[PDB]
Amino acid sequence: VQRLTYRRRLSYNTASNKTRLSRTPGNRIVYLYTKKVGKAPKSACGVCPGRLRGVRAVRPKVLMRLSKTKKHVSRAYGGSMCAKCVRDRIKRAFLIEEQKIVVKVLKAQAQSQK
Amino acid sequence: SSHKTFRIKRFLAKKQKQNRPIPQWIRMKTGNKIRYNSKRRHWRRTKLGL
Amino acid sequence: FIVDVKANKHQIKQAVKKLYDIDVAKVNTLIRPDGEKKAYVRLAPDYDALDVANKIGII
RNA sequence: CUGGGUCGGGGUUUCGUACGUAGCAGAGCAGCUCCCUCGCUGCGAUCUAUUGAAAGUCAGCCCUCGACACAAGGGUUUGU
RNA sequence: GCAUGAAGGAUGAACGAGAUUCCCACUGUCCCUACCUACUAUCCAGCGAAACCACAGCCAAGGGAACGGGCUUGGCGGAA
RNA sequence: CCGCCGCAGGUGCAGAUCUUGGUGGUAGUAGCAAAUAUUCAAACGAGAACUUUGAAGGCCGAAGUGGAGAAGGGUUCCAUGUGAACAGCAGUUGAACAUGGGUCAGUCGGUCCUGAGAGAUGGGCGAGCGCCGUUCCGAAGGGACGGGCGAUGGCCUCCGUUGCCCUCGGCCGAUCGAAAGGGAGUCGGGUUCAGAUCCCCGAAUCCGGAGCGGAGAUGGGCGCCGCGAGGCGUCCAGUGCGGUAACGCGACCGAUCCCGGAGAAGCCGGCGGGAGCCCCGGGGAGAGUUCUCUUUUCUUUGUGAAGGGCAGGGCGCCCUGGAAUGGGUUCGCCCCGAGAGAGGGGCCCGUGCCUUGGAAAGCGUCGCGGUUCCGGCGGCGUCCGGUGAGCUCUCGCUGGCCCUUGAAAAUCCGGGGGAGAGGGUGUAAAUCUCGCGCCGGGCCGUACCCAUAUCCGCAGCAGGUCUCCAAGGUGAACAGCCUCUGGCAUGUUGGAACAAUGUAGGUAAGGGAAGUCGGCAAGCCGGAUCCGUAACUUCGGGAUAAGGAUUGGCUCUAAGGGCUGGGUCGGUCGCGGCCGGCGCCUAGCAGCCGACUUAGAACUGGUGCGGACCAGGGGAAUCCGACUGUUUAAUUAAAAC
RNA sequence: CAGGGCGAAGCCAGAGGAAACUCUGGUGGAGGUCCGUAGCGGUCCUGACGUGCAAAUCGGUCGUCCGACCUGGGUAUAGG
RNA sequence: CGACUCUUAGCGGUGGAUCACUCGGCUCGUGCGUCGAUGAAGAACGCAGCUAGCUGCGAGAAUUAAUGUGAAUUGCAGGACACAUUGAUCAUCGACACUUCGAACGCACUUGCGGCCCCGGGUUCCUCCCGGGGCUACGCCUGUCUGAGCGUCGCU
Ligand SMILES: [K+]
Ligand SMILES: [K+]
Ligand SMILES: [K+]
Ligand SMILES: [K+]
Ligand SMILES: [K+]
Ligand SMILES: [K+]
Ligand SMILES: [K+]
Ligand SMILES: [K+]
Ligand SMILES: [K+]
Ligand SMILES: [K+]
Ligand SMILES: [Mg+2]
Ligand SMILES: [Mg+2]
Ligand SMILES: [Mg+2]
Ligand SMILES: [Mg+2]
Ligand SMILES: [Mg+2]
Ligand SMILES: [Mg+2]
Ligand SMILES: [Mg+2]
Ligand SMILES: [Mg+2]
Ligand SMILES: [Mg+2]
Ligand SMILES: [Mg+2]
Ligand SMILES: [Mg+2]
Ligand SMILES: [Mg+2]
Ligand SMILES: [Mg+2]
Ligand SMILES: [Mg+2]
Ligand SMILES: [Mg+2]
Ligand SMILES: [Mg+2]
Ligand SMILES: [Mg+2]
Ligand SMILES: [Mg+2]
Ligand SMILES: [Mg+2]
Ligand SMILES: [Mg+2]
Ligand SMILES: [Mg+2]
Ligand SMILES: [Mg+2]
Ligand SMILES: [Mg+2]
Ligand SMILES: [Mg+2]
Ligand SMILES: [Mg+2]
Ligand SMILES: [Mg+2]
Ligand SMILES: [Mg+2]
Ligand SMILES: [Mg+2]
Ligand SMILES: [Mg+2]
Ligand SMILES: [Mg+2]
Ligand SMILES: [Mg+2]
Ligand SMILES: [Mg+2]
Ligand SMILES: [Mg+2]
Ligand SMILES: [Mg+2]
Ligand SMILES: [Mg+2]
Ligand SMILES: [Mg+2]
Ligand SMILES: [Mg+2]
Ligand SMILES: [Mg+2]
Ligand SMILES: [Mg+2]
Ligand SMILES: [Mg+2]
Ligand SMILES: [Mg+2]
Ligand SMILES: [Mg+2]
Ligand SMILES: [Mg+2]
Ligand SMILES: [Mg+2]
Ligand SMILES: [Mg+2]
Ligand SMILES: [Mg+2]
Ligand SMILES: [Mg+2]
Ligand SMILES: [Mg+2]
Ligand SMILES: [Mg+2]
Ligand SMILES: [Mg+2]
Ligand SMILES: [Mg+2]
Ligand SMILES: [Mg+2]
Ligand SMILES: [Mg+2]
Ligand SMILES: [Mg+2]
Ligand SMILES: [Mg+2]
Ligand SMILES: [Mg+2]
Ligand SMILES: [Mg+2]
Ligand SMILES: [Mg+2]
Ligand SMILES: [Mg+2]
Ligand SMILES: [Mg+2]
Ligand SMILES: [Mg+2]
Ligand SMILES: [Mg+2]
Ligand SMILES: [Mg+2]
Ligand SMILES: [Mg+2]
Ligand SMILES: [Mg+2]
Ligand SMILES: [Mg+2]
Ligand SMILES: [Mg+2]
Ligand SMILES: [Mg+2]
Ligand SMILES: [Mg+2]
Ligand SMILES: [Mg+2]
Ligand SMILES: [Mg+2]
Ligand SMILES: [Mg+2]
Ligand SMILES: [Mg+2]
Ligand SMILES: [Mg+2]
Ligand SMILES: [Zn+2]
Prior knowledge:
Keywords (chain B): Cytoplasm, Ribonucleoprotein, Ribosomal protein
Structural class of chain A: alpha+beta
Order of helices and strands of chain A: EEH
Main location (chain B): cytoplasm
Order of helices and strands of chain C: EHEEH
Bound molecules: potassium ion, magnesium ion, zinc ion
Helix content of chain C: 25-40%
Radius of gyration of chain A: 27 Å
Subunit structure (chain B): Component of the large ribosomal subunit. Interacts with IMPACT.
Distance between the termini of chain C: 14 Å
Number of strands of chain A: 2
Number of helices of chain C: 2
Oligomer: part of a larger assembly
Strand content of chain C: 25-35%
Helix content of chain A: 10-25%
Structural class of chain C: alpha+beta
Function (chain B): RNA-binding component of the large ribosomal subunit. The ribosome is a large ribonucleoprotein complex responsible for the synthesis of proteins in the cell.
Largest interface: B-C, 8 and 4 residues
Protein name (chain B): Large ribosomal subunit protein eL39
């Protein structure tokens, strides 16, 4: 078998010194230095363990050259919060304001008594 | 080491340029007593210390 | 060329350009172990290095 | 007209029966069977014969000049 | 109980390159020593140190700072 | 240079384990003995045990005597020349000497960021150099947007610019601190005596700055003319659209301000996916063997980044629906009315495969040229399958462990909000994270050694010194032993001999610890399979307790799997195509393919068989310390800590 | 930071039981767990060496080898 | 008979004493008694035709100018307008020049990273890029400007 060598002066198997084997058009196996695995955004809800969908999982600086569509979902809080928790916050906001009007008018009516 | 600062490299440059024998025509000059370079450094014998 | 250690690639390109009235495509510099700066000055494709070397006196 | 060297040969002795060839010896298995049939062929450790065979044996074993060369030299000294 | 004894006394299974005693097995540990191998030592070519050193280097007795290579009286003494 | 008369003194050596320098006997002595090993021929040369070339025999044996680095060295690198010295024998050789040459970057690092920490200022202290302190006793903002005021004439066209003012701004702490942490983006082929992801060729890309498209966006209403189509007027829209949804599409306005994410993280187990490697069955091309036999044995048999498609993997994502006779499901789990299964779909990864790159290049082989020191020119080939608890890397999934919870910051991004901005139907406008085009990327490092000879140890010192890659056989195995690739010449000498005494290894009749302080040393045992295992016990152990049997070769037998095929009465063209009481038992069957393991049996050998290698002697007690851990580097490993 | 041994909890199935629960087989993979590499260390031969390879090394044999583990670099502590 | 050994002499070596020499010290005395933000002391690197050290010097680099002097310098070479009298050389030194670090000064100490102003170039007409020049340290004095204070007051 043809043994390999590093192609850079970093000789230690660190996190930045990660390589994949590749076969060149020249009939030889070489190291190619891989980029670090990206991670999709965690939901801003802070409760759902899974990461968001519809967003590319790249390293942070890569996001600067991606188009807007590849980074966000076409929805309110899209690409920042999961759809499930957006549904909950929509009805939570609606219901609580409904209770506030319920309490306010109930308190408005609670003036005939003592 | 292959990794070196500019100051250390420039220091090593001067030490290589100085480590040469005397020109043979120095000896012919009047009142000459220098018969051989007494400040010759060999890389393996005496170290620079830097 | 052997050039001053102070000079950078922009200065080397500018110096060679109107010293010898030629155009320069690329400059690659190194500092050799004796402390000198050696510049590899690649001329534009239309200019011929052998022709320029004759006018300089290199050969 | 001899010698003692090498090789060869014989003796001695050590180990234990060589390669190859052959075998209706071989536990079994696989193919080809109708041609006879239970035949024939292939694989197969091992066994038997050839075969007390093969191999080694003075280098500090014994007897041999069978063969082949070699030997009448070389150097340093020594006297009452 | 020279002079044991309680946060240390007393005990423990498991563990220990910890100290000790016995038994089996095992052996050159020994009776009792032999032989073999490698690398030295040995000889040669080349190369080539150091410690140490008053002067040196054969004994017996004697006396002497009471254990002498030297002194005394004997024994003796032969290159390298 | 000296005598004599006086003067003056650093004025006389045998010693001081005196000081410095020199020199002997020892002595051509000790020694040039750690790590298996050299031999033949030729060349060059004055000269060969040692250089070079070829041949042979060996070793390292992928945890290397191999290939590359970090630190350190600093020219040792490479070529040529020399042979004084040096390389403890030699030398035609060298890491020696002499002369000349050699390190090429936007995308490999530094540079930037913070870490532990270091450290200014304000302040305090201090005789004082200074010290403490790092948000604390500070008026610690020097920036930006919109608007307003005045000038500017630069491109007086009208926006840049300038000063002021208003508005808002915690910089909640300067700065330094990593060539292994964080950190955008370069790969394939060729080239040198020595350089290379840096040069050349080709193909990309990131970041920074300021043209052409495309998007925004050209819709509708009502009248009129016209066969109609189309146009005209006039008014109203228009910061894109699609999907039930998860979310999708090439863009798809937006500030101060706020929220979030990424960067951003432990160790261990199990399993799965993807490579690379190894193995296998075939086809080629070349090579080896050919006494005999072997369709044999060996070698070789590519497609980079980036883009596009796709396979594959993953998903606590979504729609339908509503589950007990509970069901699904893993090696293990685990999941479910807070929605299982089942059906349809969405997203992420995509290192694999195909394509652009791309065969033109590389490589193999057979030829033909030459400028014979050409990136020479041709021909042909670079093929088809299988297998896996294999090994390494990678990616996932899912657990376990913790009185242990396993960085920060630079930097980038999404969202919430809606102050604004844009033009009135156009030759539209603000605007644009879509496509293409244009320009730029400065500075420093880059040679080589990286070690039984380039580093440290006074040296080419058996010591020390941080890493990556890792083949075949045997086997549990990066064990040991042998081999291939690659490397080397036995570790600063060679020849002859084979005495004693050694150092290292081994064997020994009979006895068996009688030796000795003491079984010190050596020896015995040893793997695996099947049996069998005591006292005691903190019930976990003791335990491989103890003790016993077996083990080779050959020929068989049995067992342990995967995939495919459900064919239904064809009357019959959109004797292939799809409809026709239907066949619809037991595919429980037939074909094919494949891997490795276990058990049993026969035969067989001079009873040999874990045949080398690898590889626990055991038991009965006593003392101490519970255990594991630590320790006197260089005399103590312990009962000591 | 090879490869193996032992086999904790949890889980599955079967059997027994009035129940409490029990028994059997499997799965699972815990531990400052065991054998034993690399690494780290340094027991004994009171072995080699002892003007050494070495101002502490070498050989065999050893201790440990998933942890109170081994290790590079950065950083902190400075002479009573 | 030799070796070998010892003694003594001759000669040869090995070694560097002795003597002679001295551009060096030591001691005493005298006159003077002067460094630096206009960048010192010290350090680094560089500079010669051949030159490594010492010395000298700073990119104008083993020296420029000037003055004095009056034909050399020299190890070799080269130049008759670089072999010079129109001034070689040496000395003096008042003119000019004077790299980097250094109290060391934009910040940091990596030739690491800025900011402001001016000039030239990129057809610059903006942004931006390159080159060049000037400036950008702490403390403190006087003065100026801009301000702060529910510090003390005056007017409205
Ligand atoms: K036979
Ligand atoms: K026979
Ligand atoms: K112990
Ligand atoms: K290195
Ligand atoms: K770094
Ligand atoms: K760890
Ligand atoms: K391809
Ligand atoms: K005994
Ligand atoms: K212990
Ligand atoms: K003059
Ligand atoms: Mg490299
Ligand atoms: Mg999206
Ligand atoms: Mg050294
Ligand atoms: Mg460079
Ligand atoms: Mg006869
Ligand atoms: Mg008492
Ligand atoms: Mg007591
Ligand atoms: Mg107690
Ligand atoms: Mg006597
Ligand atoms: Mg006596
Ligand atoms: Mg005496
Ligand atoms: Mg007397
Ligand atoms: Mg005197
Ligand atoms: Mg005296
Ligand atoms: Mg004397
Ligand atoms: Mg005396
Ligand atoms: Mg000798
Ligand atoms: Mg010897
Ligand atoms: Mg070996
Ligand atoms: Mg081997
Ligand atoms: Mg091994
Ligand atoms: Mg020699
Ligand atoms: Mg070399
Ligand atoms: Mg040299
Ligand atoms: Mg940079
Ligand atoms: Mg401080
Ligand atoms: Mg920094
Ligand atoms: Mg890093
Ligand atoms: Mg190289
Ligand atoms: Mg761990
Ligand atoms: Mg590929
Ligand atoms: Mg690709
Ligand atoms: Mg081709
Ligand atoms: Mg895997
Ligand atoms: Mg919005
Ligand atoms: Mg290199
Ligand atoms: Mg060594
Ligand atoms: Mg070593
Ligand atoms: Mg030293
Ligand atoms: Mg391996
Ligand atoms: Mg092995
Ligand atoms: Mg040897
Ligand atoms: Mg040798
Ligand atoms: Mg050696
Ligand atoms: Mg025997
Ligand atoms: Mg015996
Ligand atoms: Mg016996
Ligand atoms: Mg016995
Ligand atoms: Mg006894
Ligand atoms: Mg006895
Ligand atoms: Mg023992
Ligand atoms: Mg026991
Ligand atoms: Mg056995
Ligand atoms: Mg006892
Ligand atoms: Mg203990
Ligand atoms: Mg332990
Ligand atoms: Mg000790
Ligand atoms: Mg111990
Ligand atoms: Mg010890
Ligand atoms: Mg203790
Ligand atoms: Mg393994
Ligand atoms: Mg079990
Ligand atoms: Mg353990
Ligand atoms: Mg253990
Ligand atoms: Mg060890
Ligand atoms: Mg000893
Ligand atoms: Mg000895
Ligand atoms: Mg460490
Ligand atoms: Mg550490
Ligand atoms: Mg002290
Ligand atoms: Mg004499
Ligand atoms: Mg002499
Ligand atoms: Mg002058
Ligand atoms: Mg730095
Ligand atoms: Zn959520």
